[PDB]
């Protein structure tokens, strides 16, 4: 185009893109900062970093890029490569890696009045402090802080982008339904934008975009919580087995090892911060300690069940507590209870005495076994109550955690 080339040659004859456009010394340049989110790619909790694919909607005015459309056959606007005009060095200040600037350098749109519009694109890694108190039933509050790296408040004034009609300001991240990809693990609840100042630094100002996002915890439920509930059921079961089965330690130790493995694997998905303990980890530790005490009490029960008068003498307090008082309360009462001829008589009498002694010994052994059974029943009830109450309480507390109706920003 002859006339567009002529206009370009006229505009940029003496235009210096390193000089901020200020018609008169002391003038400020109003820069409007908006943001459009196209895809909330990742939120890496291990490194506390949020990756987003966004457009950065900027707009300002350059008095030097002015012309009369009539003198150039009615050319209202131009698309000029962004490297040719001055732009404010608007960057993401709270990035995690070193990438400050934008990725894609699209053309700017300069209108005959001097209004410059520039909507670059970038993949930003922004550092986001993560609160783990309620992981995985947690909502995060991740921010992206944009400001001019170079110019301060005495040189550029930051404002909010205008809407499509150009009537009112847009105080929130813009989402284009035709170009937005739902994350699938996070749902966006609030997305306000707000200007921020520092009291001690009059030369500071930035536009911050907030993303209040709530995790959808189905994955963690299915793959971590239900298996631990089944393991806890087994741990409670261990106290219903009879000590004669010979499989009490197998069951209890297996439950303990399984829950420990679950904790170890889950340690890879939570941040290594130390400000609080996630609810999932608290539940896992609670179950682990409960199962360890299950192992210890099972060993105690086995020790009680394998005692005999030849080795132990039942003390009075054990008999008083476990034979008489508890069983009524636990509904586990037991049911209520000539030379040769002379030699032959002696032999029969010896056999009878042997049988009588054996019966008394067996009665005492049975008393010890009954003590073991009663203790095991008491432990069963106590552990069932504790496990149910603890699990229900922990997950009820987790369930009453939703982002506030007011973003406060």
């Amino acid at each position: 185009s002859v006339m567009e080339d002529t206009l370009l040659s006229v505009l940029f004859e003496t235009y210096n893109p390193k000089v901020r456009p200020a018609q008169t010394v002391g003038d400020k340049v109003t820069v409007r900062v908006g943001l459009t989110l196209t895809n909330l790619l990742i939120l890496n909790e291990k490194i506390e970093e949020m990756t987003t694919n966004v457009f950065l909607n900027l707009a300002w005015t350059d008095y030097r890029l002015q012309w009369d459309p009539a003198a150039y056959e009615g050319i209202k606007d131009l698309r000029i490569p962004s490297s040719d005009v001055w732009q404010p060095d608007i960057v993401l200040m709270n990035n995690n890696d070193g990438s400050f600037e934008i990725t894609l350098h699209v053309n700017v749109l300069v209108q005959h009045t001097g209004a410059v519009s520039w909507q670059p694109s970038a993949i930003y890694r922004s550092s986001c402090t993560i609160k783990v108190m309620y992981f995985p039933f947690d909502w995060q509050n991740c921010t992206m802080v944009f400001k001019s790296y170079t110019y301060d408040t005495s040189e550029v004034t930051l404002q909010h982008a205008l809407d499509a009609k150009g009537e009112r300001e847009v105080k929130e991240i813009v989402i284009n339904k035709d170009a937005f990809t739902e994350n699938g693990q996070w749902s966006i609840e609030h997305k306000p934008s707000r200007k921020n100042w520092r009291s001690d630094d009059p030369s500071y100002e930035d536009v911050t975009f907030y993303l209040i996002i709530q995790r959808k915890p189905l994955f963690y439920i299915v793959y971590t919580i239900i298996p631990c509930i089944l393991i806890s059921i087994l741990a409670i079961l261990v106290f219903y087995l009879p000590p004669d089965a010979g499989e009490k330690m197998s069951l209890s130790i297996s439950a303990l090892l399984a829950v420990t493995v679950f904790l170890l694997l889950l340690a890879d998905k939570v941040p290594e911060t130390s400000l609080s303990v996630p609810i999932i980890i608290r539940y896992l530790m609670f179950i682990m300690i409960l199962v360890a005490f299950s192992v210890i009490l099972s060993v105690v029960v086995l020790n009680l069940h394998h005692r005999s008068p030849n080795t132990h003498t039942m003390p009075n307090w054990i008999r008083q507590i476990f034979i008489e008082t508890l069983p009524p309360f636990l509904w586990i009462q037991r049911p209520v209870t000539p030379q040769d001829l002379k030699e032959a008589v002696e032999a029969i009498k010896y056999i009878a005495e042997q049988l009588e002694s054996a019966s008394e010994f067996d009665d005492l052994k049975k008393d010890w076994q009954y003590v073991a059974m009663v203790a095991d029943r008491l432990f069963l009830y106590v552990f069932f109550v504790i496990c149910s109450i603890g699990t229900f309480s922990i997950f009820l507390d987790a369930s009453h955690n939703v982002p506030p109706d007011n973003p406060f920003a």
């Binding site: 698309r79 699209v106 299915v222 032959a344 076994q369």
Partner: protein, 426 residues
């Protein structure tokens, strides 16, 4: 001397070519950029990363009236190669990429014909974002798209389009990704079912700006599941059936609980691996995940019921009473329903003999009760087997048949009758 040097110097230097100005006579005119995509290799599709890596050749074609010459004036030069950093090219960008690669990385020359037709066919490795539907894994089919937009100009200045072709004098648009039957490498895991290409327009926006149009190339691919079936599903199913088999062990073996617990722990290991192999999305629970949860719950029931059986087997008259109701329930009715099989010295001697007899009779009665409790336990575990194992087999068959009866819909764009296939142009 090479006439090409004279021609290029005439085109780019004498005529004052400006590579930052659209190639149009008048400002209000529009530029048509024809577009097509050739897939040379479907490198991978990481479900954990929700990324599709593809090796493609992205074809562009427009008209530049400033790069036109009379072939007779110069030697019969019917074509010319120029580097893209010397001429105007349209910066079409992949909008849905995971990384910062918005457009081709190798800028190859452009072919210019004497009539001004410019063609540009650079290669590219694109890492686009493809949401994964894990609902039917590993019998799933994915629907990944590559969305290309023109951000440097608005729809009033350049118009994206689909490359046209001729066969018998009528131009038909190319609504598919081009696959060369010999320059294409079939992927081991995925096979391409549909590959339409569509030019989308969004009427709620305006031609003022750069969100009014795009060209999207879709790629519907089905996973070949033999690998997972052989290496993940068969071992899991067999180990699961071992649990139901654990009902048949006698309580005197001392290994019922161990067998059931081993099966449960194996199921948990398989569940953990399945978790490792999929994205952490909450749209749906994978089919294999549902099966594993169901079978783990069922095996936990098996463990609890083996525990109850054991507790019943070790009862004795010294601690429990075999009531008549339980006796008739578990020794008369259920076994038939379940088809289960079936002078002073003389006085002292006499008193001692009587006492011995009494003790032996008591011991025999005690053993009789113990045997009755044993039979009760056997009845309980037989009933458990007949109640649980059918549920296990039916659930397995249902789950792994519903997944196998899951096919791509044979036509993309449900509301569209067109096949979008290379063999039948529109």
């Amino acid at each position: 001397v090479n006439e090409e040097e004279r021609l290029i110097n005439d085109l780019l230097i004498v005529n004052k070519y400006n590579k930052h100005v659209r190639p149009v006579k008048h400002n209000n005119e529009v530029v048509n950029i024809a577009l097509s995509l050739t897939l040379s290799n479907l490198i991978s599709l990481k479900e954990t990363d929700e990324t599709l890596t593809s090796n493609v050749w992205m074809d562009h074609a427009w008209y530049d009236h400033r790069l036109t010459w009379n072939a007779s004036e110069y030697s019969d030069i019917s074509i010319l190669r120029l580097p893209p950093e010397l001429v105007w090219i349209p910066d079409i960008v992949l909008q849905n990429n995971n990384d910062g690669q918005y457009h081709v990385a190798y800028f190859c020359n452009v072919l210019v014909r004497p009539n001004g037709y410019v063609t540009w066919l650079p290669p590219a490795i694109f890492r686009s974002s493809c949401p994964i539907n894990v609902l039917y894994f590993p019998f799933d089919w994915q629907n990944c798209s590559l969305k290309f937009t023109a951000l440097n100009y608005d729809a009033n200045e350049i118009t994206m389009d689909l490359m046209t072709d001729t066969i018998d004098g009528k131009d038909y648009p190319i609504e598919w990704i081009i696959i060369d039957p010999e320059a294409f490498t079939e992927n081991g895991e995925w096979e391409i079912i549909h590959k339409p290409a569509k030019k989308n327009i969004y009427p709620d926006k305006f031609p003022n700006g750069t969100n009014y149009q795009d060209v999207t190339f879709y790629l519907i691919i089905r996973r070949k599941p033999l690998f997972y079936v052989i290496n993940f599903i068969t071992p899991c199913v067999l180990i699961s059936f071992l649990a139901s088999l654990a009902f048949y062990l006698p309580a005197e073996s001392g290994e019922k609980m161990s067998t059931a617990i081993s099966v449960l722990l194996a199921q948990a290991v398989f569940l953990l691996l399945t978790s490792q192999r999929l994205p952490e999305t909450a749209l749906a629970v994978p089919l294999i995940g549902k099966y594993l949860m169901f079978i783990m719950s069922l095996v936990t029931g098996v463990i609890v019921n083996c525990g109850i059986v054991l507790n019943f087997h070790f009862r004795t008259p010294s601690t429990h009473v075999l009531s008549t109701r339980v006796k008739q329930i578990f020794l008369e009715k259920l076994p038939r329903i379940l088809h289960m099989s079936r002078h002073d010295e003389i006085k002292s001697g006499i008193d001692s003999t009587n006492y011995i007899v009494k003790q032996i009779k008591e011991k025999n009665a005690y053993d009789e009760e113990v045997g009755n409790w044993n039979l009760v336990g056997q009845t309980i575990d037989r009933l458990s087997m007949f109640i649980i194992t059918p549920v296990m087999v039916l659930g397995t068959i249902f789950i792994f048949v519903m997944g196998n009866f899951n096919h791509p819909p044979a036509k993309p764009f449900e509301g569209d009758p067109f096949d979008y296939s290379s063999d039948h142009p529109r």
